[PDB]
Amino acid sequence: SRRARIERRTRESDIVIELDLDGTGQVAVDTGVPFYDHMLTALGSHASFDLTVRATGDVEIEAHHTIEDTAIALGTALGQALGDKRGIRRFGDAFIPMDETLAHAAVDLSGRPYCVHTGEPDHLQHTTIAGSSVPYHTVINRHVFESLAANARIALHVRVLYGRDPHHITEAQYKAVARALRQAVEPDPR
């Protein structure tokens, strides 16, 4: 009913997205950027979507292009899946406490495309989250949220009230977006 399959082939990367807005958290994400995978998994799960993200890109350069194309593709999927947006709550918001971190997100699904991202500590503009694979530069958080809002055609305001740990700050934000989205997309019985 509220589904979308988006394929996005660029010079930089290759994306397939399958999205059901009315899902049960059946989520599989594989972008070649394992922390991004973890964030998008949290996103799909906490928004109660069913979501498959499969992506390959110029990860030898860094994660930027792949992260960005995926977020654009995902936004496009969200917009198409929403259709005419009839009889939905439209507005949604969620607070996410994650240890010392508090993040928040608010959405207007029928509002014109817009993103404002505030409150994220300055050290995230140059922080790297790195494991045994391709690393994730947290400076991209903003870029992800902007690409989502611009391609879904929605108003998306994301806040960090406070926080210290970059993994917590980042995850709380993604989870915040997820549950704001979840509340917004739900049918309104009025």
Two structure tokens written together for 46: 């906490």
Which range touches Mn ion (CB under 5 A), out of 50-58, 67-75, 114-122, 127-135?
67-75
* Per CB under 8 A, 14 contacts a second copy: no
- Phi first, then psi: what are they for 161, rounded to 5°? -75, -40
Q: At what angle do helices 166-185 and 34-46 cross, to 10 degrees?
A: 30
Number of residues that bind a second copy (CB under 8 A): 67
How far apart are CB 11 and a second copy at their closest, in Å?
10
**Cα→Cα distances 158→63, 110, 116, 124, 155, Å:** 22, 17, 6, 15, 10
The residues, ordered by sequence, that sit 6+ positions from 137 with a Cβ below 8 Å of its Cβ are 62, 63, 64, 126, 127, 128, 129
How far apart are CB 16 and a second copy at their closest, in Å?
20
How far apart are CB 24 and a second copy at their closest, in Å?
7
Rule CB under 8 A: choose which of 140, 160, 177, 185 binds a second copy: 140
Task: Find out whether 85 and 109 touch, Cβ atoms under 8 Å.
Answer: yes
Which range touches a second copy (CB under 8 A), out of 1-9, 13-21, 77-85, 153-161?
153-161
Question: Going residue by residue from 139 to 178, which x/- string records binding to Mn ion, judged by CB under 5 A?
Answer: --------------------------------x-------
